[PDB]
């Protein structure tokens, strides 16, 4: 600000018989080296959104997917080992051919690893379900041991 | 996010200059002296567009008053004769008859002095 800058506090003109404008320090914000007037100060932007609004959001975020037809509930991932070979061979027989992006919600980290690294999968933990990561993808595929934690998480 | 002015102030000042190509000095080379004569220039555009409609009245009245004196009466008798004939002709934009094709006006003076003579 005007006060925080590393200038001085000396009145740079004696204000009366100079003829130029009356000015305080160079650190005044109208000077070109000066501070800024109202520039941003580092603040936390996060706020408590109500927990019922978060739960209703994560309900309607998957309700949109089920209302379209872009929801899938697999349990047995045939792709063990986290090989993206195994995951893409799984997706070919599953019905996620790759042109439409998918949120992948699995409690199996060795398929989160497989789908971590594609241009069309947002991998996700079963607890880290959230409406922004739901909506930014066009499909949703989740495990039975992620749908169970989601169903008992929301009302 | 610091939003520099940058491109916006030049795009405004070149707009004022492109609107003001033509005036005298710094009046049309100065992007803060050309607002001061685009304000007054647009104000004169307003007042003179509303003044053109009466300028041309005070031109056509002269053309009728000079063409009806050629036929031997004055304009103040002429329009009284026209409005007692009952018309919406000659309608001073049509003080063209009195200039060119003058026999139409030479019969309109007859229909004037007849209707008020």
């Amino acid at each position: 600000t005007r006060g925080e800058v590393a200038y001085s506090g000396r009145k740079i003109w004696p204000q009366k018989h100079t003829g130029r404008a009356r000015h305080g320090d160079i650190g005044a914000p109208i000077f070109v080296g000066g501070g800024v007037v109202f520039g941003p100060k580092p603040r936390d932007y996060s706020y408590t959104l109500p927990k019922k609004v978060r739960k209703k959001g994560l309900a309607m975020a998957v309700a949109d997917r089920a209302r379209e037809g872009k929801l899938l509930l697999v349990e047995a991932f045939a792709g063990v080992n986290g090989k993206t070979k195994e995951f893409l061979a799984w997706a070919k027989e599953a019905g996620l051919d790759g042109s439409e992006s998918v949120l992948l919600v699995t409690g199996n980290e060795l398929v989160r690893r497989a789908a971590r690294n594609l241009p069309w999968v947002v991998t996700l933990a079963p607890e880290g379900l959230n409406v922004y990561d739901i909506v930014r993808t066009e499909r949703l595929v989740m495990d039975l041991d992620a749908w169970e934690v989601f169903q008992n998480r929301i009302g | 996010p610091r939003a520099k002015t940058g491109v916006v102030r030049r795009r405004k000042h070149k707009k004022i200059l492109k609107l003001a190509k033509g005036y005298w000095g710094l009046r049309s080379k100065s992007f803060r002296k050309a607002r001061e004569t685009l304000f007054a220039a647009g104000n004169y555009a307003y007042a003179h567009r509303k003044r053109r409609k009466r300028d041309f009245r005070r031109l056509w009245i002269v053309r009728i008053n000079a063409a009806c004196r050629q036929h031997g009466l004055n304009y103040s008798t002429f329009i009284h004769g026209l409005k007692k004939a009952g018309i919406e002709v000659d309608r001073k934009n049509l003080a063209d008859l009195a200039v060119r094709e003058p026999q139409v006006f030479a019969e309109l003076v007859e229909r004037a002095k007849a209707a008020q003579g």
């Binding site: - | 304000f39 647009g42 018309i87 139409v104």
Partner: protein, 101 residues
């Protein structure tokens, strides 16, 4: 021929063939005849009558390619701390070709 026509509130002198901006009418398409009010005859042997009330018994025929052109306007007032720049009036014209009397 010679003719004088009131249409759209103003009065124009018209020949066999000419017309320009005519203060846009309520006749939409291109190939559209139109019956305006003749005023004073036209100085041939057959005609030449200045007509009371504009009640000339014959009309004209006015086909037209109607369309507003945008006009270089910037119709701005200014008093002061006041800048009402924002009125530009392209002022919808209508483009007549007239046929006869």
């Amino acid at each position: 021929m010679f003719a004088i026509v009131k249409t759209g509130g103003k009065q124009y002198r018209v020949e066999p063939g000419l017309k320009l901006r005519v203060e846009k009418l309520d006749a939409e398409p291109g190939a559209t005849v139109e019956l305006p009010v003749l005023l004073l005859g036209g100085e041939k042997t057959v005609v030449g009558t200045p007509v009371v009330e504009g009640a000339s018994v014959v009309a004209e025929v006015l086909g037209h390619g109607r369309g507003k052109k945008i006009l270089v306007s910037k119709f701005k007032a200014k008093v002061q701390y006041r800048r009402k720049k924002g009125h530009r009036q392209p002022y919808t014209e209508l483009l007549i070709k007239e046929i006869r009397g």
